[PDB]
């Protein structure tokens, strides 16, 4: 009986071919090389003493094309143009990337998942699955030198880039932009005091994962009880869960159909787990309720 | 303080080796290195003869024309075929232009590797897992995943250590090295087989507690130490592997980095086993995690890259 539901990232090859190193002064981070453009975080032009309140327009007054070193592997790419767009730079290079995949830039919404290719000095180190949290942070694994690492989904042969890495907040969660250079959430690329909102739990994702658990033979948490959307939402609020909407109930329809467990019966199971805990039991090898699988992730992994 | 994730190796070097192999109606995955495609030998089985297939006898009735190899949109001509233990080696007419630097390695229990899960010769996802002490792995494999490979990367070289063959009734997975030899006592027939005792990889749990301290989770640290002797008496009671001097030696670099003695961390683990977490979490788990090696921790916390 299948019971191996795991956190799974997209194969990283199509993205690996796009990673380069960008150096400005003594600051080295990663860039994304698509066609003849390299995208990177605009704070590549910052200096150590001016991180608190950089004036990016003022900082660009003293920057020429030759102040940007771009290296694809060990191949020097000549910068022939540079512009600032939102919180990214666009470096025009003399050579189009021959490994440019079919790609799109997409904006994700809270609750949606994506793969991160963590890189250092334009070289891939590892790949893992993230979700955009309700507070617009991600729980990544990023060190000094990881800025410019990207998050993506792969759909058919199309790479949808959704994330570029910029910063680490004091609770060790991560903030960044889409590939248009607009921050997720309220964050700014300066070292002024910023805090992640209270983390809340992605309720529609927890319910998808309880459906995964049923498909994978974990049934111990199923009960006779039904609830209402209103009464469930009173419990969600108390346990710092996101509201469950009728739109979420519609999104969970296919999983309720596949398992024959009504969405509001699975809500009754979740209510009983929040109120009573797990009584030293596990679900899909966790002692915690997992919220970083979407309904779409469960369907894809459980049936391909 | 900072984050620490189950991280897979980048998969690009492997994706360029995955092909589709069909024998009769059976389609699974193969590994295309130079002019050889490696796949599970049970590609030659029929549905009604899975209990005790005679592989030698099935295979003499096979010709090159019975093996259809496809790399993307491109049919490869099979020009030779041999059996090596539980894998076929299909000599093809075209050497794989995307063949990386590689070795075949057989990993030890407690060691970790990345799985590139593939279906119809197309890579679908990547995740990290460990060789369990019972020589199973806790993978995520559906119908069609057979021939998917596990690997590590060092510098620019891919070390292939696993090829997927089967799912046991508890939903754990069994397979071979790339010499075609199973990990553990498993055999590629549908005769009753069961995984042995699932024991916790103690040295890995200690590595993960060092990872937690590096990433600012300190609550489980106590001013206590234990002897190895006294720790292992407690380990036995909770189906933990005994901790050996070799394990203590491998944990030495994390002990030095954190300045927390290995036997101090053992005292923290003994308390966690005896008392639980009392509603706290370590690196966002409410369980003790055993699928990070000491090397995995250093690699992640020091940002080691590949090409
Ligand atoms: Na001792």
B129 given a catalytic annotation:
no
Cβ atoms within 10 Å of B29's Cβ, excluding its own: 29
Taking contacts as CB-CB distances below 8 angstroms, the residues of chain A near B287 are 282, 285-287
- At what resolution in Å was this solved? 1.7
Cβ distance of B303 and A173 shorter than 8 Å = no
Contacts of residue A134, Cβ cutoff 8 Å, sequence gap at least 6 = A110, A111, A197, A199, A200, A202, A242
Q: A–B: how many Cβ contacts below 8 A?
A: 144
* Structure-determination approach: X-ray
Q: Is residue B301 annotated as a catalytic residue, yes or no?
A: no
Please tell me if residue B261 touches chain A, with a CB cutoff of 8 Å.
no
Rg (CA), chain B: 22
- B127: buried, middle or exposed (CB in 10 Å: 19+, 13-18, 0-12)? buried
The CATH number of the domain covering residues in A12-92: 2.40.10.10
Which of B6, B9, B12, B282 would best serve as a mutation to test chain A binding (most A beta carbons within 10 A)?
A: B12
With tokens 């991160």, the residue in question is: A116
- Those of residues 69-128 in B touching chain A at CB distance below 8 A are 116-117, 119, 123-127
Architecture of domain B202-302: Orthogonal Bundle (1.10)
Fold of A203-303: main proteinase (3clpro) structure, domain 3 (1.10.1840)
A8 to B127: CB separation less than 8 angstroms, yes or no: yes
B235 CA to middle of ligand 1, Å? 14
Determine the Cα–Cα distance for residues A298 and B138; give it in Å rounded to an integer: 18
Q: Which of B143, B280, B284, B303 to mutate to test the interface with A (most CBs of A within 10 A)?
A: B303
Query: Which residues, listed in sequence order, are joined to residue B68 by a DSSP beta bridge?
Result: B22
DSSP A180-210: TSPBSTT--SS-S--------B-HHHHHHHH
Task: Say how far apart CA A139 and CA A176 lie, in whole Å.
Answer: 12
Q: What is the residue whose two structure tokens read 């066609």?
A: A35
| DSSP letter, residue B66 | G
Of B16, B140, B299, the CB nearest to A301: B140
A39-49: b (≥16 Cβ within 10 Å) or e: bbbbbbbbeee
**A21 interfaces chain B, CB cutoff of 8 Å:** no
Half-sphere exposure of A111 (CA within 13 A, CB side): 18
| Distance from C-alpha of A59 to C-alpha of A51, rounded to nearest angstrom | 11
Distances (CA, A) of B53 to B41, B58, B83, B182: 11, 8, 14, 17
DSSP class of residue A129 equals E
Sorted by sequence, the CB contacts under 8 Å of residue A288 that are 6+ apart come out as B281, B284, B285, B286
User: HSE on the CB side for A195, CA within 13 Å?
Assistant: 3
Question: Would an 8 Å CB–CB cutoff place A282 in contact with chain B?
Answer: yes
* Rounded Cα gap, residues B296 and B302, in angstroms: 10
Q: List alpha helices for A52-105, DSSP H.
A: 56-61
Q: Which residue from B minimizes the CA distance to A126? A: B9
- A-chain residue closest to B172, CA distance: A4
CB burial string A12-23: b at 16+ within 10 A, e below: bbbbbbbbbbbb
**Does B140 reach chain A within 8 Å, measured CB to CB?**
yes
Burial class (CB in 10 A: 0-12, 13-18, 19+), A35: exposed
What is the distance, to the nearest Å, from the Cα of residue B148 to the centroid of all Cα atoms in its chain?
11
Query: In the numeric block, which tokens belong to residue B199?
Result: 């024991």
| Tokens standing for residue B282 | 């370590």
3-state secondary structure of B175: strand
B260: which 2 tokens? 């927390």
CA dist list (Å): B51 to A157, A175, B39, B41, B82: 39, 54, 20, 14, 22
| CA angle centred on B160, ends B29 and B77, rounded to 5° | 40
Helix (H), strand (E) counts: chain A: 8, 13
Cα distances from A183 to residues A122, A163, A175, A194, in angstroms, run 22, 9, 8, 13
Distance from the alpha carbon of residue B302 to the mean position of ligand 1, in angstroms: 29
Q: Which residue of B has its CA nearest to A216?
A: B171
Query: Cα(B229) to centroid of ligand 1, in Å?
Result: 6
For residues B242 and B200, is the Cβ–Cβ distance under 8 A? no
Residue whose structure tokens are 């940002």:
B303
* A279 membership: H or E segment, kind and range: none
* Distance linking the first and last C-alpha atoms of chain A: 16
Other Cβ atoms less than 10 A from the Cβ of A160: the count is 18
Q: Which of residues 163-182 of A touch B (CB under 8 A)?
A: 168, 172-174
Residues of chain B contacting A2 with CB distance shorter than 8 Å: 141-142, 167, 171
Q: How far is the CA of B228 from the centre of ligand 1 (A)?
A: 4
User: Would you please indicate which residues of A are annotated as catalytic (active-site) residues?
Assistant: 43, 147
In sequence order, what are the beta bridge partners of B282?
B285
Out of B17, B23, B39, B42, pick the active-site residue.
B42
* CA dist., res. B296 & res. A75, Å (int): 30
State phi, psi for A102 to the nearest 5 degrees. -50, 125
Nearest residue to A206 via CA among A245, A251, A241:
A241
Q: Cα separation of A301 and A63, whole Å?
A: 47
Helix axes A203-215, A263-276, angle to 10 degrees: 100
**DSSP symbol at A290:** -
């Amino acid at each position: 009986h299948m019971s191996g539901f795991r956190k799974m990232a997209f194969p990283s090859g199509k993205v690996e071919g796009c990673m380069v190193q960008v150096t400005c002064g003594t600051t080295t981070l990663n860039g994304l090389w698509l066609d003849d453009v390299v995208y990177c975080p605009r704070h590549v032009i910052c200096t150590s003493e001016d991180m608190l309140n950089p004036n990016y327009e003022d900082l660009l007054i003293r920057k020429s094309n030759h102040n940007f070193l771009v290296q694809a592997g060990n191949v020097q790419l000549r910068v022939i143009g540079h512009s600032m767009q939102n919180c990214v730079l666009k470096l025009k290079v003399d050579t189009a990337n021959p490994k440019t995949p079919k790609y799109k830039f997409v904006r994700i919404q809270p609750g949606q998942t994506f793969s991160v290719l963590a890189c250092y000095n334009g070289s891939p180190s590892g790949v893992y699955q993230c979700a955009m949290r309700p507070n617009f942070t991600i729980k990544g694994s990023f060190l000094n030198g990881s800025c410019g690492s990207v998050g993506f989904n792969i759909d058919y042969d199309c790479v949808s880039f959704c994330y570029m890495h910029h910063m680490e907040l004091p609770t060790g969660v991560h903030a960044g932009t889409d590939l248009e250079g607009n921050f997720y959430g309220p964050f700014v690329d300066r070292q002024t005091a910023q805090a992640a909102g209270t983390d809340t739990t992605i309720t529609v994702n927890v319910l998808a994962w309880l459906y995964a658990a049923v498909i994978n033979g974990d049934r111990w948490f199923l009960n006779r009880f039904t609830t209402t959307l209103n009464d469930f939402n009173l419990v969600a609020m108390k346990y710092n869960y996101e509201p469950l909407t009728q739109d979420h109930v519609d999104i969970l329809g296919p999983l309720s159909a596949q398992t024959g467990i009504a969405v509001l019966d699975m809500c009754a199971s979740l209510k009983e787990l929040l109120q009573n805990g797990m009584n030293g039991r596990t679900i899909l090898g966790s002692a915690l309720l997992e919220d970083e699988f979407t309904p779409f992730d469960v369907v894809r992994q459980c049936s391909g």
